């Protein structure tokens, strides 16, 4: 009955209906990632402000893909940008997505992960539909009923998962907030990130499990607060340095 | 048995401990924010890399308290650095912790949630320890397993949760990874930051009813992502701008 049991339940319930419902994208997703790898592409994640939680998660991670790499608007990675408030303001700009995809170094059959949880803004819209045009394999992860209950903000008119090849649905009900209180009109707790966290989780977890099962070892990092955690990811690191951009 | 749902049962498992075991220390931290609001101070989140993300998830949040800000370690706010291992490097500089505290506007009275999952590097405990001397209060978001299990790299031999007021127990296993394949030397599929979110979810959701519960309306936001939610928080920062340091 108490607000942080409530909460919990919820997100408890979020993670069984991803697990239950999007086991087999999850799947595709993964395979996809799997294939890039094995067909020498390279993999990138993306997401604006809070969603860019989830991308970071799978970058440079204990227990992750050593060839995840993160792909950074200025402005909107996480919320540290100051004031707060333009990170919202960026993800209106036309434009900014095409120049942060024509200046890195992703090309056509790359894989770009998208993570936005409304679908609704011209940044994420335009980083899906230019990357497409690019030649990059796009997956979203993204709720869909976004697309019903709210109207797109890019020109287009359209959603983010109109420009995926694979969709990721994040379940999570419009206005990102679990509970309510009867003395308090906003609802309030939002499970967003501990959700979209674990669908990203999910998803790399079986592309190292499929390069496995075809004989390819997963090049994976161990994390650095644990002793030798370093040493071993400096060998990880160097060996497949070519097709990671986080270091040199 | 395919890798996503071992993962997500793995998840869920963890959160299920910590809404079954940290329901009164959750209960403790929020109510210390809550009286930290009330009592006219601020309140303050921190973690190095992943374990920034937790504290970004609270910070300018749809469904969350506007008095929440984000403590930013230059190098450290997540794995934006270049290169990421910098990041890594940075976690054992003493004196870089007071410097961050010293300049920032934290004073005597206010809370700091420090989330750091192994507690052990220099940069965390010296947090601790300062902003204790500084009379801050101190809730500690760590595994306390890895205070048996690891030796601390910090020059007193102790850990993050022996300079809380409040410790939140994140559970994870020491090496921060959940999944393991025979043929795959490395574990792999972390899910710390899943835990941590929902965590300090638990935490602020708490505060939030908390102040309700006495007549204090919670000053929670709305997400800028359904119609009308930035007009909503304009209204609430600009009325607790003085305690918010992320705009003005
Ligand atoms: C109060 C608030 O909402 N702040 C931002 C929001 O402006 C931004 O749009 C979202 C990412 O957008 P997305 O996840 O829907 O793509 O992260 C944060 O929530
Ligand atoms: C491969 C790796 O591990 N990268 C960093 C790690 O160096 C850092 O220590 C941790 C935060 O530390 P903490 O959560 O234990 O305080 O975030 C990341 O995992």
Chains 1, 2 share one sequence.
């Not at 108490?2 to 979020?14: R, S």
């Not at 936005?116 to 030649?135: D, I, K, T, Y």
Request: net charge negative.
């Amino acid at each position: 009955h108490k607000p942080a049991g409530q909460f919990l339940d919820a997100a408890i319930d979020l993670l069984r209906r991803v697990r239950d419902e999007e086991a087999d994208s999850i799947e595709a997703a993964g395979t996809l990632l799997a294939d890039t790898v094995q067909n020498g592409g390279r993999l990138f994640a993306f997401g604006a402000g809070h969603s860019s939680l989830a991308a970071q998660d799978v970058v440079y991670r204990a227990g992750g893909l050593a060839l995840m790499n993160l792909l950074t608007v200025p402005g909107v990675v996480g919320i540290d940008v100051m004031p707060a408030t333009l990170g919202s303001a960026l993800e209106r700009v036309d434009g900014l997505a095409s120049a942060v995809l024509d200046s890195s170094p992703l090309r056509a059959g790359d894989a770009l992960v998208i993570i936005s949880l409304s679908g609704r803004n011209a940044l994420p819209v335009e980083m899906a539909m230019h990357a497409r045009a690019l030649g990059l394999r796009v997956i979203g992860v993204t709720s869909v009923a976004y697309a019903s209950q709210t109207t797109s903000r890019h020109a287009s008119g359209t959603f983010l998962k109109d420009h995926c090849d694979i969709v990721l649905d994040s379940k999570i009900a419009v206005g990102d907030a679990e509970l309510t209180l009867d003395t308090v009109p906003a609802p309030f707790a939002p499970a967003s990130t501990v959700v979209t966290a674990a669908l990203m989780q999910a998803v790399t977890a079986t592309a190292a499990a499929t390069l496995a099962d075809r004989g390819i070892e997963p090049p994976l990092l161990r994390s650095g607060n644990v002793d030798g955690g370093h040493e071993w990811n400096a060998r990880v690191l160097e060996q497949y340095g070519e097709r990671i951009f986080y270091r040199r």
